[PDB]
């Protein structure tokens, strides 16, 4: 049997699936630690590894990439979970090693690859406290090229009134996603600040893990694939739209929760955003 994780329903994704919008033919690059393509509940369409030492993008020795990928597109079937856009074309862009670490230039090469290969959506469920002009240049190039870019806001919590959003989420061109639980309460670790654009479910997120397992993780990095998958359903309904319209729809149709400093524009609602 298959279970629909609570967050897939909380952002109102089943509504569009009922209407026949499941993300078909939309291409989503999951820039992360790889995706185990043999998981029976994932179908991976391609990818490329930027990590020198682990040249196979379909080998996820860390787990993070496979989990993020499952939230974006776990298949609709009799097993496991269901993704926000279960028919999306999933591409594993490996920029992080088995220890979950990455050099910014591997990350930039990942993004360049995504641009060259005409990705529609890029998900970066990763963040550092530092940025680099090269990193802003790659992210801004992607958005200029018409790609929807979504990134985890960071799991740094509150530092009084200091913004704690990390990079690349802190860049205006990137949609920075924070984490709420089932009751739309901000998770204590979720980074806060003026650069936070929307919130998605990020606490006890059941998704796929390497070796035909499933498991629940917490993080803004679990919030982010929910908004990348929502960008994929909007475009499967309106193939038509630019990354600028998809971003605006997501931001303008949110359920406003508390203060923007903590919640940005609020909880995305992809049924309202897809028009
Ligand atoms: Ca499934
Ligand atoms: Ca931003």
From Swiss-Prot:
GO cellular component annotations of the record: extracellular region
Temperature-activity profile: Optimum temperature is 48 degrees Celsius.
Cofactor dependence: Ca(2+)
Source species, domain of life: Bacteria
Annotated effect of mutating residue 21 to F: In strain: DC-4
Domain Peptidase S8: 5-274
Binding site for Ca(2+) 2: 169, 171, 174
Activity: how regulated: Completely inhibited by phenylmethylsulfony fluoride (PMSF) and partially inhibited by benzamidine hydrochloride, leupeptin, and pepstatin A.
Swiss-Prot/TrEMBL keywords: Calcium, Hydrolase, Metal-binding, Protease, Secreted, Serine protease, Signal, Sporulation, Zymogen
Compartments, as annotated in UniProt: Secreted
Catalytic residues identified in the record: 32 (charge relay system), 64 (charge relay system), 221 (charge relay system)
Cofactor details (free text): Binds 2 calcium ions per subunit.
GO biological process: fibrinolysis; proteolysis; sporulation resulting in formation of a cellular spore
GO molecular function per UniProt: metal ion binding; serine-type endopeptidase activity
Entry keyword Cell inner membrane: no
Described purpose of this protein according to its UniProt entry: Subtilisin is an extracellular alkaline serine protease, it catalyzes the hydrolysis of proteins and peptide amides. Has a high substrate specificity to fibrin.
Misc: Secretion of subtilisin is associated with onset of sporulation, and many mutations which block sporulation at early stages affect expression levels of subtilisin. However, subtilisin is not necessary for normal sporulation.
Assembly description: Monomer.
Family under the similarity heading: Belongs to the peptidase S8 family.
Name assigned to this protein: Subtilisin BPN'
Organism: Bacillus amyloliquefaciens (Bacillus velezensis)
Species lineage: Bacteria, Bacillati, Bacillota, Bacilli, Bacillales
Residues represented out of the complete protein: 108 to 382 of 382
């Amino acid at each position: 049997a298959q279970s629909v994780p609570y967050g897939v329903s909380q952002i109102k994704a089943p509504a569009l699936h009922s209407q026949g919008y499941t993300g078909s033919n939309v291409k989503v690059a999951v820039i992360d630690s790889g995706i185990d393509s043999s998981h029976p509940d994932l179908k991976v369409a391609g990818g490329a590894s930027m990590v020198p030492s682990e040249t196979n993008p379909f080998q996820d020795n860390n787990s993070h990439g496979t989990h993020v990928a499952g939230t974006v597109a776990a298949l609709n079937n009799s097993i496991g979970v269901l993704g926000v856009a279960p028919s999306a074309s999933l591409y594993a862009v490996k920029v992080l090693g088995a220890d979950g670490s990455g050099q910014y230039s591997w990350i930039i090469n990942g993004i360049e690859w995504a641009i060259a290969n005409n990705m529609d959506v890029i998900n970066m469920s990763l963040g550092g406290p530092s940025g680099s002009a090269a990193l802003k240049a790659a992210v801004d190039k992607a958005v200029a090229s018409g790609v929807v870019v979504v990134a985890a806001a960071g799991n740094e919590g509150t530092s009084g009134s200091s913004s704690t959003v990390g990079y690349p989420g802190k860049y205006p061109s990137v949609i920075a996603v924070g984490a709420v639980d089932s009751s739309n309460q901000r998770a204590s670790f979720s980074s806060v600040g003026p650069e936070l654009d929307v919130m998605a479910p990020g606490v006890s997120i059941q998704s796929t893990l390497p070796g035909n397992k499933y498991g629940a993780y917490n993080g803004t990095x679990m919030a982010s694939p929910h908004v990348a998958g929502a960008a994929a359903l909007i475009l499967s309904k309106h193939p038509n739209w630019t990354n600028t319209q998809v971003r605006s729809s997501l931001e303008n149709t949110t359920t406003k929760l508390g203060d923007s400093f903590y919640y940005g524009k609020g909880l995305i609602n992809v049924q309202a955003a897809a028009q």
